[PDB]
Design a protein around this ligand. Structure first.
Ligand SMILES: COc1cc(OC)c(NC(=O)Nc2cnc(C#N)cn2)cc1Cl
Length: 269
């Protein structure tokens, strides 16, 4: 057995939020870099469960558009997760405030986000918190869906399970999660992918939350795409946004038909 191979040094402190601390671990022998999430199962009614589900799902995921899972280590209260390293940073960190990015790049990113979500969904799992700070990028600039701390399975043994736990991020959360007691997991994830498309194409967020009480959300229902936040979006990708940001979750577009979308399949643009 090659000596010293199980010794990753925590070079940098990648993240530092509500979760715990994410360090950039580099192997002592190989130098393989990796991201290490240090989750803290404290007290007696918090992470002891918060992390088991995140770790249980990660042990299923296997798509090149999803952050690869290596392993984990339960040391007393400190739980270390071995996940993929994305030197690309956050997609979020590639959106020019109030501007966006070149329309071609959005399209690419949107394809890979669709890729992973199709995959995730395939294996009955919903992320529930799709947003630019969760869409990581690597060396070749490929999109990776990360952080499955709120992901849950919505299909098991071929039975869909409606949801009712309100979790995610206000601006990105779909409308039905704030107006309906129960809802289908998948359409909530497409809606968020849609909120990302607009962010990627306008460098700004449509509204604070998908509720009548919110100025812009209402004008979007008025179809006031004039000189308002969507005035920065081209009619092609705007036509698609009209289909995703549909309120009735049952009338929304579905990942399959998004692939059949014009802009989605228009070259370079
Ligand atoms: C400073 O830019 C960065 C910020 C990051 O977020 C913590 C990362 N993180 C990653 O490489 N990957 C990951 C993968 N999974 C999680 C979870 N849960 C967090 N970070 C990398 C860079 Cl390069």
């Amino acid at each position: 057995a090659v000596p010293f191979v199980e010794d990753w040094d925590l070079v940098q402190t990648l993240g530092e939020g509500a979760y715990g601390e994410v360090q950039l671990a580099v192997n002592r022998v190989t130098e393989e870099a990796v991201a290490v999430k240090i989750v803290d199962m404290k007290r007696a009614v918090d992470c002891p469960e918060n992390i088991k589900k995140e770790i249980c799902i990660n042990k299923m995921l296997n798509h090149e558009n999803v952050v690869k899972f290596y392993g984990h280590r339960r040391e007393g209260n400190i739980q270390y997760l071995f996940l993929e390293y994305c030197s690309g940073g956050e997609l979020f960190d590639r959106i020019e405030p109030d501007i966006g990015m070149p329309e071609p790049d959005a399209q690419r990113f949107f394809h890979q986000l669709m890729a992973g979500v199709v995959y995730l969904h395939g294996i009955g799992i919903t992320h529930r918190d799709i947003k630019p700070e969760n869409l990581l990028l690597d060396e070749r600039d490929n999109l990776k869906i990360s952080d499955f701390g709120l992901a849950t399975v919505f299909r098991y043994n071929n039975r869909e399970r409606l949801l009712n736990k309100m979790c995610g991020t206000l601006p990105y959360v779909a409308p039905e999660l704030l107006k309906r007691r129960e809802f289908h997991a998948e359409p909530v994830d497409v809606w968020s992918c849609g909120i990302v498309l607009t962010a990627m194409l306008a460098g700004e967020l449509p509204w604070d939350q998908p509720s009548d009480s919110c100025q812009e959300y209402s004008d979007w229902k008025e179809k006031k795409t004039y000189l308002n936040p969507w005035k920065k979006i081209d009619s092609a990708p705007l036509a698609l946004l009209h289909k995703i940001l549909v309120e009735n979750p049952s009338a929304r577009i579905t990942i399959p038909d998004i692939k059949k979308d014009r802009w989605y399949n228009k070259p370079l643009k």
